[PDB]
XYZ file of C-alpha atoms in Angstrom:
422
model
C -62.025 47.684 -9.343
C -61.791 46.148 -12.799
C -59.290 48.940 -13.106
C -57.582 47.818 -9.923
C -56.912 44.311 -10.161
C -55.684 44.634 -13.547
C -52.920 46.709 -12.187
C -52.982 43.806 -9.616
C -50.905 41.463 -12.508
C -48.403 43.910 -13.228
C -46.997 44.633 -9.832
C -43.475 43.328 -10.147
C -42.536 45.556 -13.085
C -43.888 47.874 -11.806
C -41.127 48.091 -8.116
C -38.717 46.669 -10.520
C -38.826 49.537 -12.596
C -39.418 52.324 -9.844
C -35.901 50.931 -8.586
C -34.093 51.304 -11.260
C -35.006 55.111 -11.167
C -35.013 55.586 -7.841
C -31.432 54.451 -7.676
C -30.170 56.770 -10.424
C -29.055 60.309 -8.434
C -31.110 62.424 -10.816
C -30.273 65.893 -8.664
C -29.621 68.690 -9.893
C -25.634 69.664 -10.449
C -24.894 73.291 -12.502
C -21.275 73.164 -11.725
C -21.182 69.795 -13.894
C -23.171 70.808 -16.541
C -22.700 70.258 -19.864
C -24.073 70.030 -23.887
C -24.835 66.729 -23.426
C -25.869 66.900 -19.933
C -27.771 70.928 -19.688
C -27.912 69.850 -15.415
C -26.650 67.726 -14.680
C -25.287 63.700 -15.106
C -27.933 62.100 -12.599
C -30.124 63.979 -14.307
C -29.227 63.282 -18.407
C -28.869 59.576 -17.045
C -32.942 59.380 -15.309
C -34.159 60.548 -18.569
C -31.818 58.377 -20.945
C -33.553 55.423 -18.327
C -36.757 56.618 -19.297
C -36.113 56.401 -22.829
C -35.048 52.617 -22.135
C -37.872 51.203 -21.317
C -40.108 52.947 -23.119
C -37.899 51.403 -26.583
C -37.669 48.543 -23.989
C -41.593 47.900 -24.094
C -41.577 49.338 -27.920
C -42.518 53.228 -28.163
C -40.932 55.734 -30.002
C -39.170 58.322 -27.544
C -37.855 61.904 -28.831
C -34.936 64.305 -27.208
C -35.303 68.031 -27.026
C -31.246 68.941 -26.463
C -30.915 66.491 -23.258
C -33.156 68.098 -21.030
C -36.604 66.557 -22.006
C -38.461 64.519 -23.805
C -41.365 62.488 -24.554
C -42.192 59.047 -24.598
C -45.146 58.688 -27.286
C -48.556 56.783 -27.782
C -51.886 56.120 -29.198
C -53.741 57.376 -32.416
C -55.424 61.025 -33.696
C -55.725 64.173 -33.949
C -55.685 64.966 -30.408
C -53.240 64.586 -28.013
C -53.202 64.151 -24.066
C -49.882 65.523 -21.892
C -49.282 64.094 -18.687
C -46.166 66.266 -17.890
C -43.608 65.102 -15.524
C -40.429 65.008 -13.505
C -36.937 62.298 -12.932
C -34.732 65.337 -11.548
C -35.259 65.372 -7.944
C -33.991 67.097 -4.874
C -30.952 66.119 -2.524
C -30.807 64.104 0.699
C -31.578 66.313 4.097
C -28.652 64.639 6.677
C -28.974 62.426 8.555
C -31.586 59.504 7.032
C -32.190 56.174 8.588
C -31.093 54.380 4.847
C -29.396 55.097 1.792
C -31.839 57.406 -0.485
C -30.732 56.797 -3.561
C -31.073 53.051 -2.368
C -34.789 52.364 -2.916
C -35.749 49.633 0.272
C -39.020 47.477 -0.681
C -40.743 46.783 2.730
C -43.930 45.148 2.305
C -45.895 47.239 1.745
C -43.553 50.179 0.893
C -41.334 52.324 -1.238
C -38.297 54.060 0.114
C -36.436 56.142 -1.470
C -35.885 59.660 -1.714
C -38.689 61.267 -4.970
C -41.058 58.316 -4.621
C -42.916 61.121 -3.452
C -42.375 63.432 -6.014
C -42.036 62.816 -8.808
C -40.623 59.336 -9.648
C -43.467 56.689 -7.930
C -46.223 58.503 -10.046
C -44.259 58.706 -13.519
C -43.816 55.358 -12.942
C -47.551 55.226 -12.257
C -48.534 56.852 -15.717
C -46.070 55.246 -17.850
C -47.702 51.723 -16.448
C -51.239 53.255 -17.275
C -50.346 54.083 -20.759
C -48.103 50.398 -21.107
C -51.083 48.212 -19.442
C -53.056 49.891 -22.370
C -51.532 49.410 -24.953
C -50.571 45.623 -23.457
C -54.934 45.275 -24.257
C -54.680 45.900 -28.215
C -56.869 48.658 -26.743
C -58.072 51.198 -30.533
C -55.932 54.451 -29.427
C -58.937 57.542 -30.468
C -55.957 60.138 -29.805
C -52.415 59.887 -28.729
C -50.532 60.712 -25.748
C -47.990 62.415 -25.248
C -46.020 61.417 -21.136
C -43.601 64.388 -21.503
C -40.243 64.099 -18.855
C -38.529 67.614 -17.825
C -35.534 67.575 -15.763
C -35.115 70.896 -15.216
C -36.976 72.480 -11.834
C -36.117 75.905 -13.419
C -38.834 75.074 -15.811
C -42.324 75.542 -15.634
C -43.408 74.110 -18.509
C -44.340 77.769 -20.095
C -44.973 77.647 -23.470
C -41.789 79.732 -22.742
C -39.890 77.165 -21.887
C -37.675 74.765 -23.630
C -40.030 71.383 -24.337
C -42.921 74.211 -25.395
C -40.487 76.225 -27.804
C -41.053 73.794 -30.646
C -43.071 71.159 -29.213
C -46.759 70.360 -30.240
C -49.133 71.481 -27.112
C -51.133 69.228 -26.203
C -54.179 69.920 -26.387
C -55.328 68.963 -22.561
C -53.338 67.128 -19.562
C -52.154 66.826 -16.507
C -49.393 68.783 -15.221
C -49.376 68.961 -10.662
C -46.697 71.503 -10.737
C -47.167 74.261 -12.739
C -48.773 77.460 -12.963
C -49.270 78.163 -16.881
C -48.025 74.841 -18.215
C -48.190 75.032 -22.373
C -51.388 73.348 -22.199
C -55.005 74.410 -24.404
C -57.186 75.318 -22.384
C -59.420 78.898 -21.872
C -58.743 80.572 -24.833
C -57.266 84.859 -24.236
C -59.336 87.327 -23.809
C -58.623 92.116 -24.667
C -61.657 94.258 -25.194
C -61.379 98.047 -26.756
C -62.311 100.661 -28.143
C -61.975 102.517 -30.949
C -62.891 105.700 -30.783
C -63.710 108.159 -33.028
C -62.373 112.039 -33.796
C -64.865 114.677 -34.081
C -63.720 116.422 -37.010
C -64.763 119.964 -35.821
C -65.663 121.399 -39.606
C -68.454 123.401 -40.993
C -70.050 122.155 -44.280
C -73.660 122.334 -46.692
C -76.268 120.909 -45.688
C -76.069 116.992 -46.006
C -79.049 114.778 -47.534
C -78.340 113.040 -44.337
C -77.800 113.950 -40.751
C -77.133 111.192 -38.602
C -78.196 112.285 -34.914
C -77.922 109.316 -32.919
C -77.634 105.822 -33.630
C -77.738 102.774 -30.797
C -76.239 99.346 -31.096
C -75.767 96.820 -28.764
C -75.484 96.078 -24.689
C -72.760 93.688 -23.823
C -68.829 93.481 -24.946
C -69.632 90.023 -25.482
C -72.721 89.508 -26.484
C -73.464 89.968 -30.519
C -76.400 92.913 -30.814
C -79.538 91.961 -31.779
C -80.786 94.861 -32.449
C -79.720 98.339 -34.109
C -81.216 102.369 -33.973
C -80.889 105.120 -36.271
C -82.092 108.690 -35.899
C -81.802 110.423 -39.056
C -82.706 114.168 -40.167
C -83.814 113.830 -43.496
C -83.174 117.488 -45.724
C -85.762 116.561 -48.452
C -86.279 112.374 -50.269
C -87.784 110.582 -47.414
C -89.474 108.235 -49.517
C -86.751 106.684 -51.672
C -84.661 105.935 -48.268
C -87.304 103.914 -46.983
C -88.199 102.229 -49.542
C -84.362 101.037 -49.492
C -84.685 100.524 -45.956
C -87.289 97.932 -47.000
C -85.500 96.740 -49.566
C -81.710 96.398 -47.611
C -84.022 94.220 -44.954
C -85.443 92.109 -48.117
C -81.972 91.856 -49.354
C -79.977 90.703 -46.017
C -83.116 88.831 -44.683
C -83.759 91.007 -42.112
C -86.226 91.894 -39.520
C -86.568 95.958 -38.507
C -88.869 98.917 -39.659
C -88.948 102.697 -39.882
C -91.088 105.365 -38.215
C -90.992 108.964 -39.250
C -91.819 112.231 -37.221
C -91.351 116.212 -38.023
C -88.144 114.938 -40.668
C -86.398 112.494 -37.990
C -86.563 109.125 -39.674
C -85.941 106.085 -37.181
C -84.153 103.312 -39.038
C -84.543 99.812 -36.552
C -82.885 96.071 -36.939
C -83.324 93.520 -35.445
C -80.732 90.478 -34.879
C -79.913 87.876 -33.802
C -77.470 87.645 -30.442
C -74.770 85.309 -28.675
C -71.679 85.754 -27.467
C -76.843 84.571 -35.384
C -76.384 87.707 -37.127
C -74.593 91.342 -36.337
C -77.845 94.358 -36.330
C -75.473 97.247 -36.446
C -72.924 96.830 -38.420
C -75.393 95.210 -40.846
C -78.016 98.389 -39.896
C -74.096 101.217 -40.740
C -74.060 98.702 -44.139
C -76.958 99.961 -45.219
C -76.058 103.677 -44.007
C -73.089 103.220 -46.380
C -75.249 103.771 -49.602
C -76.375 107.801 -48.461
C -74.636 111.030 -48.651
C -74.467 111.736 -44.527
C -72.281 114.053 -43.165
C -69.094 114.319 -42.511
C -68.871 112.355 -39.416
C -71.211 110.033 -39.710
C -69.911 108.922 -43.278
C -66.394 108.663 -41.997
C -68.220 107.207 -38.998
C -69.965 104.464 -41.204
C -67.638 103.956 -43.664
C -65.155 102.953 -40.584
C -67.305 100.305 -39.947
C -67.526 99.106 -43.394
C -63.491 99.243 -44.146
C -62.803 97.348 -40.724
C -65.426 95.343 -38.812
C -68.465 94.726 -41.847
C -68.469 90.781 -42.202
C -65.065 90.310 -39.987
C -66.248 87.706 -37.979
C -62.724 86.784 -37.911
C -60.663 89.556 -38.000
C -59.443 89.356 -41.332
C -59.986 93.122 -41.947
C -58.621 93.854 -38.968
C -56.243 91.701 -40.664
C -55.567 89.138 -38.267
C -56.762 86.470 -39.307
C -59.292 80.361 -34.990
C -58.402 84.191 -33.853
C -63.007 86.178 -33.240
C -63.798 89.604 -32.493
C -67.417 91.271 -31.559
C -68.590 94.281 -32.018
C -70.839 94.135 -29.152
C -71.156 98.386 -28.357
C -71.580 100.846 -31.645
C -72.595 104.286 -29.981
C -73.289 107.697 -31.979
C -74.302 111.736 -31.700
C -73.933 114.588 -32.641
C -72.300 115.617 -29.855
C -69.278 112.717 -28.805
C -69.132 111.288 -32.140
C -69.440 107.579 -31.893
C -66.879 104.970 -31.369
C -67.082 100.624 -31.706
C -66.121 98.487 -28.406
C -64.855 95.435 -29.739
C -64.131 92.013 -27.634
C -61.380 89.859 -28.829
C -60.686 86.385 -28.300
C -57.591 84.336 -29.893
C -55.344 80.803 -29.066
C -52.203 80.550 -28.251
C -49.870 81.604 -30.160
C -51.523 84.579 -31.810
C -48.537 87.558 -31.399
C -51.428 90.251 -29.774
C -49.093 93.324 -28.899
C -47.697 93.155 -32.851
C -50.864 92.847 -33.917
C -52.463 95.931 -31.717
C -49.615 97.384 -33.119
C -49.924 97.810 -37.117
C -53.542 98.252 -36.242
C -53.355 101.437 -33.967
C -50.621 102.852 -36.230
C -53.054 102.309 -40.094
C -56.045 103.754 -38.064
C -55.419 107.010 -37.172
C -55.590 107.789 -40.890
C -59.476 108.172 -40.027
C -59.510 109.780 -36.986
C -59.258 106.563 -34.988
C -57.334 105.644 -32.700
C -57.363 102.431 -29.871
C -57.996 103.154 -26.006
C -57.564 98.660 -24.575
C -58.609 97.462 -21.975
C -56.904 94.586 -20.041
C -55.517 91.508 -21.988
C -55.733 88.426 -20.719
C -53.746 86.145 -22.494
C -54.689 82.133 -23.211
C -53.737 79.402 -20.333
C -54.619 75.931 -19.187
C -57.067 75.904 -16.608
C -57.000 72.477 -14.219
C -60.300 72.170 -12.883
C -61.595 72.425 -16.289
C -59.629 70.366 -17.745
C -61.869 66.967 -19.750
C -58.805 64.537 -18.126
C -58.120 66.265 -14.575
C -61.637 66.305 -13.491
C -61.667 62.698 -15.085
C -58.863 61.774 -13.032
C -60.547 63.210 -9.539
C -63.896 61.232 -11.136
C -61.721 58.468 -10.613
C -60.382 58.609 -7.375
C -62.696 59.404 -6.337
C -64.878 56.670 -8.052
C -62.400 54.530 -6.598
C -60.442 55.658 -3.729
C -62.132 57.221 0.162
C -38.463 65.689 1.951
C -36.377 63.233 4.933
C -37.372 59.129 5.304
C -39.332 59.899 1.840
C -41.233 56.696 1.064
C -44.660 55.676 -1.442
C -46.791 53.211 0.028
C -47.251 50.404 -2.108
C -50.663 50.736 -2.072
C -50.687 55.101 -3.135
C -47.739 53.226 -5.814
C -51.123 50.632 -7.653
C -53.610 53.527 -6.451
C -52.174 56.871 -8.503
C -51.979 53.074 -11.627
C -55.139 52.651 -11.490
C -56.418 55.583 -11.593
C -54.799 56.925 -14.506
C -55.813 53.840 -16.269
C -59.373 54.897 -15.652
C -59.211 57.972 -16.214
C -57.050 57.587 -19.270
C -59.087 54.345 -20.719
C -62.653 56.707 -20.717
C -60.471 59.305 -22.373
C -58.541 57.899 -25.585
C -61.114 54.788 -25.838
C -64.019 56.246 -25.687
C -65.673 56.199 -22.597
């Protein structure tokens, strides 16, 4: 409530600006639109009005085709995004006032857009201003992004974000998928080998089975290969130990009646893939046709490509979490893939699936879930709810002076702690 009485000092100014904004009849008019006013004159003036008060108060602004724009504050690498709207739905008939003539009651402001979204826009705005008035030492930039087109849902695909920087965190009450960083996208898929049904001479080494990995999203910490050894057991055991030593790994081998069991420990999470290293050792040997192609595939595409590089998809992130092989079915890799907003996974998997068929392998992809914002997990959104709790216990549309100044003091708290650290 140091916040709350900090807002007390700006009361006149807040109501005055809100009045200015409310007096503009920023209702959509598609019939009157033009290049200068792509959703009508009304909304265009409301957007400009925000720019004017920003210029009046020393802030930089940036306009986008006269349909949306932003007010800029603060400094630092991260930008906090606060999205809102100054366009307004029409006045239903029979009000007990003129909807675009703000009436200032003893304790309330009555007009259209008092609730959505002009009250809150001004509230958000004055937060940034008041902090600017105190010469705070900003740690994050802020983009107060203002729209006029109710047909936008702020999608990464909608106009503003077609070209403008994504907020690294933020608040967007109305939007389902606003273009704001949050959760990385996710897919899983399998690389399945075509078993080559072809006779051959008896190899030095035959892979009977390979197993590594329980979950798509964990680094396998264990790998086991079982191998029928034709002649020389002693060299492969010696080389395996040297391999363990050179790559700083734990593992061992067991021999019984010509069956060699090779086992590698590795470290997990979601820290060394045991299966990939074990396949890397197997590539030095003369194996049967199918184990050889299977082992070679992992070396060409998978080994030491934590970040997609070898699949030419790289931060994008790939985990090889399942690895099987037997004589019968011929093995497969189960892949987990994470990616940030702005990676093209379609054309990527296209170039990959196509390029792989060369080696009798094919993609079978699982479900794909694209990158997206999660309000409830947004660091700002949480600080806002923390401050409500910390502070608080369309026809004839009105907003209370107390909701109005409550909102402001709440943005103030949350914004402060996230931008001037707290």
